[PDB]
């Protein structure tokens, strides 16, 4: 089977360093350039260098000159990234890609792509959440009230949120996280709920923050 | 640097209906052009190399057409599994990637329900203000958020993230947190956050007053 | 040039150019 | 004027090496890539190697890598194929081609070949040929007969069959040689002539075998 | 590793007649695909690069056409140096040959002289005992001969060899040998040959009895 399997990703200071691995199985590695492709939700898609099928030839964007060096062994089937004196910018989604071996005058289709892995560079250290309510506001605005709390202030991702310990999930909408200012990251999670079971209904929102080994149960009632 | 920009940036579409994208290119790229398609936490995969040849193993249904600095991706008959992001990109002179076409799956329209929440009394006591503005259930993806405190419009001290559609929901729901500082927060009345949908013939407001509310 | 071929091409040229 | 002779083919035991060598002439010997390829009846025309035009980049088909090396020497218009640790399965007749220059993304159109030069392996030890008589039947002057001689058992080819000291030329038929299983060749080669002469014409095959100095001959006369 | 298949394997064919040959790729290769022709006792000689480019020397006669996996070669007057064994090749991904389709001589069909020699005496000090069964001047190439030790028939005892077509009456000719032990010779009693061909409305069998 065909396929590029990715290894070496992290959450690292600015200034360390990093190794991303590619091992490659199913085809004949030795003969195929192949190139890392890192990939935001600002940037977008993005190219990175690229290493030859026997590594004589070496092309990296201007971004990352100097500081990143492309890399492989033929002899393991793994293709390498060395990362140092990482910046923040360098925070991605990182992919090898395979060169299509379509006869032309140019080459750049990628027929080949792996699952990828995440860099993420930040000076920030683990840090648990703080939950903040969302309390809901005059009832009969359709006869349906919202409220939800506000997952603030933490390090790294991920954070799961649920209702009422998964027995609330009709009108939840945890939206995604954002990287605040700070360098720490900010979550919403809002549920829609009849306005006739505010002041008869118990709401609490689970937020668990496994980096950090934090648990928090908040509940949401009416001001 | 050759810039890919492709044409729209969002489109609706129904299963078994026929899609075009469009992707400029700031520069002649002769025809060295590629198709891919991205789902959600996955990889692209290639479909159309070459401008217009197709990647084996994908249906029959894409085709890639167009020369120079105007190029088109279509589907003739839009599948389920097509509902996903296409990047063009170019590899005449080294390689870059286009903003993407995110195809959604077509509906009605639906003018949002705004909700506004303020800032709790525990997060004052830390020193900051988290103004909360709800954007919920509506549909196309495209709407405009403006935060205004004593009618005066902020900017570039808010953040908002949107929801996609999934097996239980046809629309979207957005979040807008202003962030305050609590001295300024206690500067002022009046917290307003106005909403400019397609479903709304006028801009609605959504406000409340500190100390009020 | 860095979009030539960056694969193993047997059926490449063998003559000189 | 552009041509390609090649020579060091011969009989060689399993185990053993040699060396072909492609002389080019006409052309810039210097320019061009350079193949060989080896033709047997059972696999038909199949590829060896290529070497670059300047030796740096070599390719090997699987079934003679580590054994054949394919080499190059521009100062004399020479191709080389060193063959060692030859197999039985690597008998065929070797031909050297060059790499037709049209421009294009791939190349391999063979423009020149080579006359080509015949390897043979095999275990077996050189034995002359044991030839026997296809006596015909005499009946029915009135008609042909068919009369001939097996050559049985020797190594390696080939043989000249002649009849009648190359008199008789007519009518015959000299079968290509079939190889056993004990590792010797077989060949038959008769001829048809009128049965009428049968009772007083005489015919004599001539079996000469150069590689072990072996000269038969049979008269072959009606059985019945 | 991309397989070349070529169809037919062989074909007879008369001078001025328009003769297509057609040989399959395993995979696509565009147009990465050459034809030869060789003589016998000779070295192939390149006729069409490119699917359909014509190589310098060769006549207007061949052409190439087809692209992908499906090609094919085309003679437009059969020349009567135009007999030979044609082979088509790609040159995509490393370098492979067709089988090879042979252009022979059309004639009139004609029935084999079957004959079948017994063994000599001098074999019989050997301990070894070859029967040889004979076809003479036979059209076309398809034959088969099946050897019947009384009324058992025989599996891998014996070779065949096959002569060119004739220069003159344009035939084949063929040589079955059949090998057997003195001791195994001398055991049984009826020894045939029987021969199936066009030219024979019903198989001839060509034997003889031990003595």
């Known amino acids: 089977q065909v396929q590029l399997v990715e290894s070496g990703g992290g959450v690292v200071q600015p200034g360390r360093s990093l190794r991303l691995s590619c091992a490659a199985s199913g085809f004949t590695f030795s003969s195929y350039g192949m190139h890392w492709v890192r990939q935001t939700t600002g940037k977008g898609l993005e190219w990175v260098a690229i290493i030859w099928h026997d590594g004589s030839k070496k092309y990296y964007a201007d971004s990352v000159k100097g500081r990143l060096t492309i890399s492989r062994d033929n002899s393991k089937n ?33 027929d080949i792509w792996g699952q990828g892995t995440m860099v993420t560079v930040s000076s920030a250290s683990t840090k648990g959440p703080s939950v903040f309510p969302l309390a809901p506001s005059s009832k009969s605005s359709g006869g349906t009230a919202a409220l939800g709390c506000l997952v603030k ?26 990287l605040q200012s700070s360098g720490l990251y900010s979550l919403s999670s809002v549920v829609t709920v009849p306005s006739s079971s505010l002041g008869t209904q118990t709401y609490i929102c689970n937020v668990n923050h496994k980096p950090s080994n934090t648990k928090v149960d908040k509940k949401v009632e009416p001001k | 640097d050759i810039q890919m920009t492709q044409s729209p940036s969002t489109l609706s579409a129904s299963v078994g209906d026929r899609v075009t994208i469009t992707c400029r290119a ?18 692209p995969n290639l479909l159309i190399y070459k401008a217009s040849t197709l990647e084996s193993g994908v249906p029959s249904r894409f085709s890639g057409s167009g020369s120079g600095t105007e ?13 996903a992001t296409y990047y063009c990109q170019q590899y005449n002179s080294y390689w870059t990637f286009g903003q993407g076409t995110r195809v959604e799956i077509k509906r009605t329209v639906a003018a949002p329900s705004v909700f506004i929440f303020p800032p709790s009394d525990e997060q004052l006591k830390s020193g900051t203000a988290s103004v909360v503005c709800l954007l919920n259930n509506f549909y196309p993806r495209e709407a405009k958020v403006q935060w205004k405190v004593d009618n005066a419009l902020q900017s570039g001290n808010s953040q908002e993230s949107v929801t996609e559609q999934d097996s239980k929901d046809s629309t979207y729901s957005l979040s807008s947190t202003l962030t305050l500082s609590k001295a300024d927060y206690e500067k002022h009345k009046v917290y307003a956050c106005e909403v400019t949908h397609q479903g709304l013939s006028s801009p609605v407001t959504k406000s409340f007053n500190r100390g009020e509310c | 040039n860095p979009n030539a071929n960056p694969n193993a091409n047997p059926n490449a040229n063998p003559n000189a150019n």
């Not at chain 1, 293709?79 to 140019?106: H, I, P, W």
């Not at chain 1, 991702?157 to 999930?169: F, R």
């Open chain 1, 78 to 110: 793994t293709l390498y990234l060395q990362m140092n004196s990482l910046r923040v910018e360098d925070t991605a989604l990182y992919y090898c890609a395979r060169v299509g071996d379509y006869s032309d005058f140019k080459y750049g289709a990628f």
């Open chain 1, 153 to 178: 202030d933490y390090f790294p991702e991920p954070v799961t949120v649920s209702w009422n310990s998964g027995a609330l999930t009709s009108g939840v909408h945890t939206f995604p996280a954002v």
């Open chain 2, 26 to 43: 700031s520069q002649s790229i002769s025809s060295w052009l590629a198709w891919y398609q991205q789902k959600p936490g996955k990889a």
């Open chain 2, 71 to 83: 190029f088109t991706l279509t589907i003739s008959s839009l599948q389920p599994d097509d509902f």
